[PDB]
């Protein structure tokens, strides 16, 4: 119970983290498609820069968006039954005696 209660309550003091909602999606990228001997990845729109025709969307693409971007509405916090929280303090106290 002491482990169970400690390892649910310690999650409650925990600040959210998330990747930005726009990360990897601030291109106007579009797949070239078949017939171009290239792998149907959304490529960046043309122009004499290094990015032009690279690979802009997808977990695997450099730049790109991560797979399943981390949200701030992850269930961060855990609630423990008051009776269980009590029966963790009791235990934690009685262990200190010996």
């Amino acid at each position: 119970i002491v482990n169970f209660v400690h390892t649910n309550l310690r999650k409650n003091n925990r600040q959210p983290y998330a990747v930005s909602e726009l990360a990897g999606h601030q291109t106007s990228a579009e797949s070239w498609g078949t017939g171009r001997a290239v792998a149907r990845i959304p490529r960046v729109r043309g122009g004499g820069t290094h990015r032009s025709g690279q690979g802009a969307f997808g977990n695997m693409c450099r730049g790109g968006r991560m797979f399943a971007p981390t949200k701030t509405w992850r269930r961060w916090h855990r609630r423990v039954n008051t009776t269980q929280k009590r029966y963790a303090i009791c235990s934690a106290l009685a262990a200190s005696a010996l």
């Binding site: 959210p16 949200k71 701030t72 509405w73």
Partner: protein, 201 residues
């Protein structure tokens, strides 16, 4: 596609719901803000009850809750009249007034009149210029012993009256509770059509 026996279930997630996800990381910051703004309000009203003005004893509507009593918007103008408090003076000594509240019963009225009698007795009233008391205020020895009341002033507790064990009479034994209810139903249901055919006769 449904696997086997499972619940038939319809998530409401077909709209762009992720744009409008309200998170509650504010929650402890909100509670700190509300508590600081409550302490800050309570300090501004130095002697006055922190909770706000007295509310009336009020029955809850609809059959589910009419066994309960809750605090109201404010005292009825006819609850204030019998108490003998001018509706514009009431608000200045910390008495909630709503002119919308009727009074259908004498019990609800007299409960809320007696409620205001208790308030007007307990209430210590400070003079306007403190250095010279005038005729319609509280004495200077009471003014020094006047300090805030925390939580709702005269809190409205719901109380059921004590009854002792009665010897059961033969009337109470002979009374057919179930038969009486089923008669009552049919009488209320067949009141209009009986009276329709008394007309025909």
């Amino acid at each position: 596609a449904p696997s086997r026996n499972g619940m038939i279930l319809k998530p409401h997630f077909h709209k762009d719901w992720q744009r409008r996800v309200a998170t509650w990381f504010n929650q402890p910051a909100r509670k700190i803000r509300r508590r600081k703004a409550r302490q800050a309000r309570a300090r501004r009203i130095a002697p006055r009850p922190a909770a706000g003005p007295i509310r009336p004893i009020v029955r809850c509507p609809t059959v589910r809750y009419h066994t309960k009593v809750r605090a109201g918007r404010g005292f009825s103008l006819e609850e204030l009249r019998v108490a003998g408090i001018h509706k514009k003076v009431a608000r200045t000594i910390g008495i909630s007034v709503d002119p919308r509240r009727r009074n259908k019963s004498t019990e609800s009225l007299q409960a809320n009149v007696q409620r205001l009698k208790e308030y007007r007795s307990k209430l210590v009233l400070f003079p306007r210029k403190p250095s010279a008391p005038k005729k319609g205020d509280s004495s200077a020895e009471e003014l020094k012993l006047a300090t805030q009341l925390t939580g709702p002033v005269m809190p409205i507790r719901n109380v059921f009256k004590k009854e002792k064990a009665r010897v059961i009479t033969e009337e109470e034994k002979n009374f057919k509770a179930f038969a009486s209810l089923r008669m009552a139903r049919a009488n209320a249901r067949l009141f209009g059509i009986r009276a329709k055919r008394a007309k025909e006769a």
